[PDB]
Each structure stands twice: as C-alpha cells, then as structure tokens.
Short mmCIF file of C-alpha atoms and ligand atoms in Angstrom, two decimals:
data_model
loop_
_atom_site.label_atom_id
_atom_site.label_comp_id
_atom_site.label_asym_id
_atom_site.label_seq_id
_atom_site.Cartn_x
_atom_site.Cartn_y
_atom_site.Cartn_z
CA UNK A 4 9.22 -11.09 -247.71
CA UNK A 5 9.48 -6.84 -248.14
CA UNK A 6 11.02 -4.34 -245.98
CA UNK A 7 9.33 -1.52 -245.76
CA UNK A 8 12.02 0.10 -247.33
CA UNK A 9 14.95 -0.88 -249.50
CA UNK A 10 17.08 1.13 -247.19
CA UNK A 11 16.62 2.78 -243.59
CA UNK A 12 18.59 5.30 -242.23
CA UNK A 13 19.57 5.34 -238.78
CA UNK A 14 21.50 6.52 -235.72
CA UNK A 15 23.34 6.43 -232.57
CA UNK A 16 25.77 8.60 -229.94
CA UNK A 17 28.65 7.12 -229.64
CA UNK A 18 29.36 5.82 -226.25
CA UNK A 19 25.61 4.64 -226.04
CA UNK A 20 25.76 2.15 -223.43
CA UNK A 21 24.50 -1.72 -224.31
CA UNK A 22 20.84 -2.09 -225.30
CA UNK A 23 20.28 1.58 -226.27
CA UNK A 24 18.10 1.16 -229.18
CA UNK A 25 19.32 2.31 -232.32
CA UNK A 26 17.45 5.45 -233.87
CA UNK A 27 15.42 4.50 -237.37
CA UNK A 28 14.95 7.74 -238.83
CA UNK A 29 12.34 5.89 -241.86
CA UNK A 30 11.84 3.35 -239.68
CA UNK A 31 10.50 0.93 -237.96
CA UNK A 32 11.97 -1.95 -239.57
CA UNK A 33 9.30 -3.94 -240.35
CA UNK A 34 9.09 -7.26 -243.13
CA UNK A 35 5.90 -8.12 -244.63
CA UNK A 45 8.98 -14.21 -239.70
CA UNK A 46 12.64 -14.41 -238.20
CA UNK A 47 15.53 -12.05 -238.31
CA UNK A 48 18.91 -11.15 -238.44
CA UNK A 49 21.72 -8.69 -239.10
CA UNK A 50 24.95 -8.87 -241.28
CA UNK A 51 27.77 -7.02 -242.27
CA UNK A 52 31.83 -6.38 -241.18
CA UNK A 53 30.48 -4.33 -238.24
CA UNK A 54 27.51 -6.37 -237.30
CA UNK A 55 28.91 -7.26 -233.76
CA UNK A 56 28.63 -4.30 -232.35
CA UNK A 57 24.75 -4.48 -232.21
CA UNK A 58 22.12 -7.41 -231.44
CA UNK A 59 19.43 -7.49 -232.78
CA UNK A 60 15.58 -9.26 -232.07
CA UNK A 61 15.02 -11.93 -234.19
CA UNK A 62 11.33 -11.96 -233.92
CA UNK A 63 10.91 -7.71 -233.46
CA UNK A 64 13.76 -6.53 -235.78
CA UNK A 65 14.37 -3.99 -232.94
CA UNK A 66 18.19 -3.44 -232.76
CA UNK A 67 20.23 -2.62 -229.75
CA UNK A 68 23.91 -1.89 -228.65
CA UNK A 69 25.66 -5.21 -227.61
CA UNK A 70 26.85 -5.61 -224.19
CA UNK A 71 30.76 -5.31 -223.48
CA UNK A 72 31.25 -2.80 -226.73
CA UNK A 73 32.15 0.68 -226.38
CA UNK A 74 31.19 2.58 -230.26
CA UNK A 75 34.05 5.41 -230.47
CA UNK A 76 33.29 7.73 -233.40
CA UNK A 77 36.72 8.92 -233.06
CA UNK A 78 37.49 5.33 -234.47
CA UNK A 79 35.57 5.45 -237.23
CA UNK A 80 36.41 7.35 -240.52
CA UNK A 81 33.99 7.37 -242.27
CA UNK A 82 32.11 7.70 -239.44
CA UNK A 83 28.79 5.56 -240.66
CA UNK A 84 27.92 1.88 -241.31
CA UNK A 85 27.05 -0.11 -244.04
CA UNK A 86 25.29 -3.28 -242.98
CA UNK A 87 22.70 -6.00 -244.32
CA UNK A 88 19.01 -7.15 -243.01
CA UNK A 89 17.54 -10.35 -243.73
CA UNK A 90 14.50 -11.41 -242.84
CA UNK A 91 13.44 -15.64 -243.22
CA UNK A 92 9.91 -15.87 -244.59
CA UNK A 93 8.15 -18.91 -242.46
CA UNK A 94 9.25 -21.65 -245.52
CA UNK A 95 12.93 -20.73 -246.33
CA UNK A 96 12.68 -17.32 -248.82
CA UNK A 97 14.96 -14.27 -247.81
CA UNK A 98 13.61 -10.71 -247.81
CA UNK A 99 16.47 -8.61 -247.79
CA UNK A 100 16.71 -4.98 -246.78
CA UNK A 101 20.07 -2.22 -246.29
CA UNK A 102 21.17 -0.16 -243.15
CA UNK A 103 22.89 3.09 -243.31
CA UNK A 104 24.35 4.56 -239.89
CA UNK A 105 25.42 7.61 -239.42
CA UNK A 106 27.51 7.50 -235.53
CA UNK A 107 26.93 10.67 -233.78
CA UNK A 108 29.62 12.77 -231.93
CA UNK A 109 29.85 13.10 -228.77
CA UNK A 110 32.36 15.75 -227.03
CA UNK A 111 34.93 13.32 -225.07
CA UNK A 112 37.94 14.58 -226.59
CA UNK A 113 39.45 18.17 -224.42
CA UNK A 114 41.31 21.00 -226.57
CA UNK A 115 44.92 19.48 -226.28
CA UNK A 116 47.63 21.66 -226.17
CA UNK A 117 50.63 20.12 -226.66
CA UNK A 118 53.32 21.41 -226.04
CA UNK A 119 51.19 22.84 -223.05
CA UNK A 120 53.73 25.62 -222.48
CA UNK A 121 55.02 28.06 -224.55
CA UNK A 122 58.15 30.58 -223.97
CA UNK A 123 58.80 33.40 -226.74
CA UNK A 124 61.14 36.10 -226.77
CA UNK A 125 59.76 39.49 -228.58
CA UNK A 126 61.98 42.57 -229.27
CA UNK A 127 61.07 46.09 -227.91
CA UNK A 128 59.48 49.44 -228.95
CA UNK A 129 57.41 47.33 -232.00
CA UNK A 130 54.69 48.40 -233.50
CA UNK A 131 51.08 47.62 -232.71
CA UNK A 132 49.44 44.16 -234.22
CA UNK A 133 52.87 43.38 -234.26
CA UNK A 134 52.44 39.04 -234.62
CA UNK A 135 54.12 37.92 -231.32
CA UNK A 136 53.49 34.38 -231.98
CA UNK A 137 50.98 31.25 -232.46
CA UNK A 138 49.32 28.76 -230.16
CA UNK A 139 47.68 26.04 -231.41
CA UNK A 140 45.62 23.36 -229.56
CA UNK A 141 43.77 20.41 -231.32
CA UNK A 142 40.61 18.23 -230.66
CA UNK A 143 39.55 14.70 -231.96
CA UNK A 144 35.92 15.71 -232.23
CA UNK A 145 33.97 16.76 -235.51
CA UNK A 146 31.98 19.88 -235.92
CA UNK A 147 31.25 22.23 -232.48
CA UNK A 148 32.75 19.88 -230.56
CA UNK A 149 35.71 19.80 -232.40
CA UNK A 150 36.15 23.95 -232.93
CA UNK A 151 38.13 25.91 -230.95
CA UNK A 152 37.95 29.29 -229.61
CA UNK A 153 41.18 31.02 -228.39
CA UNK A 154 41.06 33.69 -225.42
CA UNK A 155 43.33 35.14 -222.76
CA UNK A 156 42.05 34.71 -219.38
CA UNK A 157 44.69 36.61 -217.81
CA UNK A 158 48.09 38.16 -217.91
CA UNK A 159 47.92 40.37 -220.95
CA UNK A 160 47.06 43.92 -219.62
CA UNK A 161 45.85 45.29 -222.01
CA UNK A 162 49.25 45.34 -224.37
CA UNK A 163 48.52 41.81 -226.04
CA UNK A 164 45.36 40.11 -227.94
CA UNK A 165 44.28 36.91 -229.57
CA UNK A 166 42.75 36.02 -232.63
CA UNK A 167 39.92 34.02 -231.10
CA UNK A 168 40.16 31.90 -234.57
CA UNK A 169 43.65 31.75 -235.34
CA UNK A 170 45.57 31.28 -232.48
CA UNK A 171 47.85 34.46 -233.08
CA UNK A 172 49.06 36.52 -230.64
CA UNK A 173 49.54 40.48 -231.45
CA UNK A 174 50.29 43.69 -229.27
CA UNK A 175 47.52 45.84 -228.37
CA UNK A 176 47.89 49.70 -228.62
CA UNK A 177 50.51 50.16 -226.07
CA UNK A 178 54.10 50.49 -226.74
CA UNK A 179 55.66 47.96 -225.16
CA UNK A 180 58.74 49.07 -223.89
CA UNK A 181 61.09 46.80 -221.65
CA UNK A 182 62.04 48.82 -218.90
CA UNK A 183 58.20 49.41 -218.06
CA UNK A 184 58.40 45.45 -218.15
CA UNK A 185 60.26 42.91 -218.52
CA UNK A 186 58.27 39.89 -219.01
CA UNK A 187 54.23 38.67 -219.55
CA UNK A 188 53.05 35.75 -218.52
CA UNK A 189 49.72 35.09 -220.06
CA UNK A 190 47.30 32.30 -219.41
CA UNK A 191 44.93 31.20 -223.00
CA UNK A 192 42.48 29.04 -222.84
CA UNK A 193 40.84 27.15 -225.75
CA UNK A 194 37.25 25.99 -225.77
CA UNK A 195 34.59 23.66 -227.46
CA UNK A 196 31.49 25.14 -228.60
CA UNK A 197 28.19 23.57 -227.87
CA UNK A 198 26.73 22.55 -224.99
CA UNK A 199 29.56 20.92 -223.60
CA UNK A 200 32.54 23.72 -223.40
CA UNK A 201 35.26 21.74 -222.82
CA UNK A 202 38.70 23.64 -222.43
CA UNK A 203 42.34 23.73 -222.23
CA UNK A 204 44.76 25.88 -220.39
CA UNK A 205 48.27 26.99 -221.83
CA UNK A 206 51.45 29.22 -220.38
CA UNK A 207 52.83 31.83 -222.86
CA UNK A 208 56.12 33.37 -221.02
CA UNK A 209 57.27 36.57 -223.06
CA UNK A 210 60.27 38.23 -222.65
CA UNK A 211 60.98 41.45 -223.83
CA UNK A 212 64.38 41.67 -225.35
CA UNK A 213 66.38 44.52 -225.08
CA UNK A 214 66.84 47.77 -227.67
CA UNK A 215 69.62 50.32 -225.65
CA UNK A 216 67.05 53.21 -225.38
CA UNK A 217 67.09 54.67 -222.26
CA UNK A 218 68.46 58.19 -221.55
CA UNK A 219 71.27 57.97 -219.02
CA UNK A 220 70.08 60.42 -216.57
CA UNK A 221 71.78 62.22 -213.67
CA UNK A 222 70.21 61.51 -210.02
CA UNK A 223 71.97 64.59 -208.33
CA UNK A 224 71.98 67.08 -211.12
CA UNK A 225 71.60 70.24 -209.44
CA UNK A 226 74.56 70.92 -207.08
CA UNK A 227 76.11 74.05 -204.97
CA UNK A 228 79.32 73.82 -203.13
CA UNK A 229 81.77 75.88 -201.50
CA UNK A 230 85.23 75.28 -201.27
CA UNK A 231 87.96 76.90 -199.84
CA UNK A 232 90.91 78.38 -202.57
CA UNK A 233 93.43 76.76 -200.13
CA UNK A 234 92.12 73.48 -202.00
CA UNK A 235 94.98 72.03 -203.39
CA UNK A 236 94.81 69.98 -207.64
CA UNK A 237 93.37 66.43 -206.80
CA UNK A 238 90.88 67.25 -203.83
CA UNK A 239 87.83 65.62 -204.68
CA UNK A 240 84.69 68.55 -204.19
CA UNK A 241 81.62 66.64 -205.67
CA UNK A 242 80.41 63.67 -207.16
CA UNK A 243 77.68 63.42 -210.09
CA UNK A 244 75.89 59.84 -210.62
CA UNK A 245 73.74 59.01 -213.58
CA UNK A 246 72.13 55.30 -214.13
CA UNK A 247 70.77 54.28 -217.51
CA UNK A 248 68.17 51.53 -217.12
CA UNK A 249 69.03 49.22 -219.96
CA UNK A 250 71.07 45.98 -220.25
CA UNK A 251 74.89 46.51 -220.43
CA UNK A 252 75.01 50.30 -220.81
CA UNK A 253 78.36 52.15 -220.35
CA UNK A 254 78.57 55.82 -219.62
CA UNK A 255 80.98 58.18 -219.88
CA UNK A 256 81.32 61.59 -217.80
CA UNK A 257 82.46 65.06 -219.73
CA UNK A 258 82.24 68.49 -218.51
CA UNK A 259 81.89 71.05 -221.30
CA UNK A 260 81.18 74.49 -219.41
CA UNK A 261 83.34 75.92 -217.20
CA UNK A 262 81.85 79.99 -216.81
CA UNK A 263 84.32 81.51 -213.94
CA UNK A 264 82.63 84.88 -212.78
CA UNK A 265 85.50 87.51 -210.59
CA UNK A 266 83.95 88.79 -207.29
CA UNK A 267 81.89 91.23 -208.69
CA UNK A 268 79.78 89.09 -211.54
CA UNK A 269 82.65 90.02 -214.14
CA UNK A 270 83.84 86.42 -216.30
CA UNK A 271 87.37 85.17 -216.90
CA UNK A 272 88.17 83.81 -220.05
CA UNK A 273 89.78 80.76 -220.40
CA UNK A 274 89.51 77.93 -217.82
CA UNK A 275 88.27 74.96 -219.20
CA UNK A 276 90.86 73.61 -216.86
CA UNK A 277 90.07 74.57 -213.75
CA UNK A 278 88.06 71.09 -212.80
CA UNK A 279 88.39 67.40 -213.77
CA UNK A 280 85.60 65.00 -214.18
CA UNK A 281 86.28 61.32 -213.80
CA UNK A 282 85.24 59.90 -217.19
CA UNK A 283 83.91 56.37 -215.22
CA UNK A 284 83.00 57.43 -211.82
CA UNK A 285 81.51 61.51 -212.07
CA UNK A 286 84.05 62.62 -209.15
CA UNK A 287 84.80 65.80 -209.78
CA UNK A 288 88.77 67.43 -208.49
CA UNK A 289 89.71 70.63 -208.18
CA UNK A 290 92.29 70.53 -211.72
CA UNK A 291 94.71 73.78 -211.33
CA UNK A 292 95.17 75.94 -208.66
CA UNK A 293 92.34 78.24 -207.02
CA UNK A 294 92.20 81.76 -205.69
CA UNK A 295 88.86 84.09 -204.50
CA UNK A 296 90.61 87.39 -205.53
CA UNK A 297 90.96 85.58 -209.12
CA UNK A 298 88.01 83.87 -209.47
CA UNK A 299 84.88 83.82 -206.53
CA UNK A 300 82.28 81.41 -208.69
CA UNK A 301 82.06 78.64 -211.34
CA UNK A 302 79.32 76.84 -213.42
CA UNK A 303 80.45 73.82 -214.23
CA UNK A 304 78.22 72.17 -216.89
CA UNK A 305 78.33 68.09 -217.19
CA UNK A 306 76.36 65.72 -219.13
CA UNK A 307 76.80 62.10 -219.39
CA UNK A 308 76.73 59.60 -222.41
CA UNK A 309 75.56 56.22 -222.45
CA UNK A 310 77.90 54.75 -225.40
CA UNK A 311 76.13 51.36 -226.12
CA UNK A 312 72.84 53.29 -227.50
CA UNK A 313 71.63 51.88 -230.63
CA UNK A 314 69.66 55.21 -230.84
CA UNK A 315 71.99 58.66 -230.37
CA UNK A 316 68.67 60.54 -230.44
CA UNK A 317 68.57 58.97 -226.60
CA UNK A 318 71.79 58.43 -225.58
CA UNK A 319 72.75 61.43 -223.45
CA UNK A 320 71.70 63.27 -220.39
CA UNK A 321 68.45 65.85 -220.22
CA UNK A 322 68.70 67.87 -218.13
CA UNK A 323 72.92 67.99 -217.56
CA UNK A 324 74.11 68.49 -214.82
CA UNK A 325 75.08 72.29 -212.80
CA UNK A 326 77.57 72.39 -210.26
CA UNK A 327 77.95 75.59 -209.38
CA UNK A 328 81.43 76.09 -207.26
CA UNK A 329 81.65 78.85 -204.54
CA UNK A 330 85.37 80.12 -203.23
CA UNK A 331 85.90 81.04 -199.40
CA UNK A 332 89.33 83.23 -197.65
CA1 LIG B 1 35.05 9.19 -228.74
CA1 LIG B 2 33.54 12.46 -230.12
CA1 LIG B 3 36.14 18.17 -228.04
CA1 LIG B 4 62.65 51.36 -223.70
CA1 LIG B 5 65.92 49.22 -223.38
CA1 LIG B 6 70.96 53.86 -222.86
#
C-alpha cells in the first residue's frame, strides 16, 4: 500500500465536540483495504477503518492549554487485503480557542502615591495574565473609570502614570479607578480590577485667616486682659500647628498724628488668635490702632508656604 503522502498535516479547535472531523490540510487520507491509527495520543480520536476519515472520540475534551507543544505526532497504517502494511505520518497542529478570561490576581490593588509629583510620574503596575496563545492570549490595559483626567495607562504595559494635572491632596484625597484588561480577536474577553490611591501628604498649604479684616471699638475704660477680638486661621493639611504673632502696632493721636512706641499695647494668644487689651488705654493718648497679625503654620516642609497672605488688620477704635 501508499499514502498519498508520506505525511499530512492537519487540524482541530480545541474543545471540538466528539465526531468533529479532523481538518486534512494535504489531505484526504487516502491508501492505494483496512485502517487504523497509532501513537501516545491516539485515543483521543477514532478513526474509520474502511474510510480513513478521523473524528474526535466521544467522552474526550482536547484542551490546548494542556498541551505544550501544542501539536501531535501520530502513526497511520493501512492493511493491504493479504497482510502488507502501508504506513503513512500525522502532524496536528491543536488550534486555540479563547476559554481562558484576563485573570487578575490579586484582583485589587491599593497604592499610596506622594503629592505635588511631576507628570508621567510611574504610580504603579497592574498586571493580569491569560492561558491562551496569540490574540487570545494578549492583553490590552484601559481605565474605564475613575481617573479624571489626572492618571493614564500604558495600554501595553500595565503602568500607571499621572496625566498633566498636578495632583495635589487637598483638591483630593483619594482615586479609585476601575482597569479593565481585554483579549483581542473576536472574542474580547475581559477582566475588571480596583486600584485605590491615596494621596499622601506634603505640609503645603498656606495657613490662612477666615476673618482677616476687622474694625472694633472699644471703650479706654477697658481694663489689661479684656478680650476685644478674635482672629482664626485653618491650614488644610494633616497635623499642622499654627502659631499667632502680631508685628504692627501703628497708634495714630486724635488728629491722624502717630505715637511711637507701643508694640505693647495688645496681646495675641500664640494658640488661640484672642486678642487682650495688654497695657492701659486712653482716647486723649491714643484714638486708633492698626494692629497687623499673621499666622504661621510650623510643620511646613516648604517655608515658601507656610505663613498667612493676606495678614490680618484689626484696626482698634477708642470711645469717652
Ligand atoms: Ca482550553
Ligand atoms: Ca485556549
Ligand atoms: Ca483568553
Ligand atoms: Ca497641596
Ligand atoms: Ca498637603
Ligand atoms: Ca501648612
């Protein structure tokens, strides 16, 4: 006997349910009479031993995944009518299929990221994985949602960057982002992942005054420790802790004519910005003041922010 050829290529999906006829590309197999099939994974076919047509077997599930190499190597024989043996080979290659989804695992991911860094700054890396082989094994990385606008992905590597946006902590806090990874192909299998990220905290916030214009009068029978006014800052970082100085005190006489020397006529509270009446008043002496505080956040890791703009006026009136 003589195959038609010495050796036929062939195929099959994977998954290819019982009797699916295997795919001869060179084929058909044809002996010029009984047949049969041989080789370490012969049972996973029959085949006809008159038609040398072969066929899945019933009850046997061909996984690609579980093949590597993934292709065959078997042996044809074919029985001339009085006892010779024809013999031919069979290469095949097992087709992928796409049954395996972009894993991520872990599925979750929580990162904590410094502020005020620079743009493309590389936040971190997610990276998913898939048991398939060529498109339906790729991936392609994208945020669905969550980023605005201040974060990106490379839709390769997995790496997550800032955008062009300073990303400053007390604008936000946290970003919770939602990336998906997908198959190419015709089948676009995907998988779903949390990034959490937190913005750490740089002390870079201007403590700044929330009453910072002020006019009262008092009257000069105020007596040292009567509490006039009250200035309040807040500084919107983590931990801050401010301190409250006056620096002017300008004392005009009834008639717009200044005073020297009274850089002790008021007392701020250092922790608190009450302000008291310090030593003792009188109109005839003194009818105005303009009393200039600022306020210093001392925890600032940056001194070019760390105090108050604008200050603060209080400008004090006398009354008989
Ligand atoms: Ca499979
Ligand atoms: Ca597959
Ligand atoms: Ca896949
Ligand atoms: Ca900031
Ligand atoms: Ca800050
Ligand atoms: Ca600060």
């Amino acid at each position: 006997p003589l195959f038609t050829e010495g050796t036929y290529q062939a195929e099959v999906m994977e998954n290819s349910p019982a009797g699916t006829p295997l795919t001869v590309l060179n084929g058909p197999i044809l002996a010029l009479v009984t047949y049969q099939l041989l080789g370490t994974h012969s049972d996973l076919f029959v085949i006809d031993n008159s038609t040398g047509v072969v066929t899945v077997r019933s009850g046997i599930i061909i996984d690609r995944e579980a093949f590597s190499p993934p292709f065959l190597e078997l042996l044809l024989l074919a029985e001339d009518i009085g006892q010779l043996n024809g013999t031919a080979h069979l290469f095949i290659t097992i087709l992928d299929d796409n049954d395996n989804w972009p894993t991520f695992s872990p599925p979750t991911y929580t990162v904590h990221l410094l502020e005020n860094c620079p743009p493309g700054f590389p936040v971190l890396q997610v990276t998913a994985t898939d048991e398939d082989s060529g498109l339906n094994g790729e991936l392609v990385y994208r945020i669905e949602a969550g980023a605005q606008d201040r974060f990106l992905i490379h839709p390769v590597t997995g790496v997550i960057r800032v955008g062009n946006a300073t990303i400053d902590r007390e604008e936000q806090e946290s970003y919770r982002l939602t990336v998906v990874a997908t198959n190419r192909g015709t089948v676009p299998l995907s998988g779903t992942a949390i990034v959490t990220i937190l913005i750490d905290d740089i002390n870079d916030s201007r403590p700044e005054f929330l009453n910072p214009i002020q006019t009262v009068s008092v009257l000069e029978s105020a007596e040292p420790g009567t509490i006039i006014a009250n200035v309040t800052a807040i500084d919107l970082d983590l931990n801050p802790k401010l301190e409250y100085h006056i620096i002017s005190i300008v004392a005009k006489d009834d008639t717009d004519r200044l005073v020297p020397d009274q850089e002790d006529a008021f007392a701020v509270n250092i922790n608190t910005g009450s302000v008291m009446v310090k030593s003792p008043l009188n109109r005839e002496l003194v009818a105005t003041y303009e009393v200039t505080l600022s306020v210093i956040d001392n925890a600032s890791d940056l001194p070019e922010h760390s105090v108050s703009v604008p200050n603060a006026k209080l400008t004090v009136n006398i009354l008989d």
